[PDB]
């Protein structure tokens, strides 16, 4: 249908509440991280990211972003520790980005926007599969990583290089042997809060873990994101930029951190 959700003026974040009333709920994401009001919790443990046996499959343009999909049939790529009481399996990653380097991230830090934000999405092994997990308040754990512009990120290059092949909605490419360790910063210091999916259906099923340290990507690398299209092949060109939801009200949730 013509007014399927998206990021345009007619179908974007300001409109989502009409089909998805939880958009105005109590635990929506993303949020602004005010570093004066976030609370250092010395009891927060280190994150445990185990990606050395991750098995990537394919990369696809779904008309909203591009997703790299993983084999989540075993404990090959798991997130645990940190604020988490369970183990979560990686199913996909994707990014959100802007029409210029000055915006594109979903989370903000003291109102500062980054050029992009990477989401690694993981689901809780208590629940059987992803579809079941998103119905539970502790169903998902999303690791959020900001992108700033500087030096190139070597581990991102395979992704950048393939994007020309999946320009339009519905296109995919094989994408094997991709190592998601190559997308992580040196430090795993983090903020965490309870929240939601940032796209429809906006379900309030996510433990967010947002890394303090951005990764650096080159200007050339993030520029390639902006060549993707929201549209299908043959349809009028609608460039895939500004596929981010703005910050939502915190509503008395506590953001906790592993540092001051
Ligand atoms: Zn996302």
From Swiss-Prot:
Changing residue 94 to C/D/E/N/Q: Strongly reduced CO(2) hydrase and p-nitrophenyl acetate esterase activities, impaired stability of zinc binding. Changing residue 119 to E: Strongly reduced activity. Changing residue 117 to Q: Strongly reduced activity and sulfonamide affinity. Keywords: Acetylation, Cell membrane, Cytoplasm, Disease variant, Lyase, Membrane, Metal-binding, Osteopetrosis, Phosphoprotein, Zinc. Its main location: cytoplasm. The record marks 92 as: Involved in the binding of some activators, including histamine and L-histidine. The modification N-acetylserine is found at residue 2. Changing residue 142 to G: Weakly impaired activity. One of its GO terms (molecular function) is cyanamide hydratase activity. Changing residue 62 to A: Reduced activity. Changing residue 62 to H: Reduced proton transfer. It catalyses: hydrogencarbonate + H(+) = CO2 + H2O; urea = cyanamide + H2O. The keyword RNA-binding does not apply. Optimum pH is 6-8. Changing residue 67 to Q: 2-fold decrease in enzyme efficiency, as determined by kcat/KM ratio, and efficiently inhibited by chlorzolamide. GO terms for cellular component: apical part of cell; cytoplasm; cytosol; extracellular exosome; myelin sheath; plasma membrane. The active site is at 64 (proton donor/acceptor). Changing residue 106 to A/Q: Strongly reduced CO(2) hydrase activity. GO terms for biological process: angiotensin-activated signaling pathway; carbon dioxide transport; morphogenesis of an epithelium; neuron cellular homeostasis; positive regulation of cellular pH reduction; positive regulation of dipeptide transmembrane transport; positive regulation of synaptic transmission, GABAergic; regulation of chloride transport. Belongs to the alpha-carbonic anhydrase family. This is Carbonic anhydrase 2. It comes from Homo sapiens (Human). The gene is CA2.
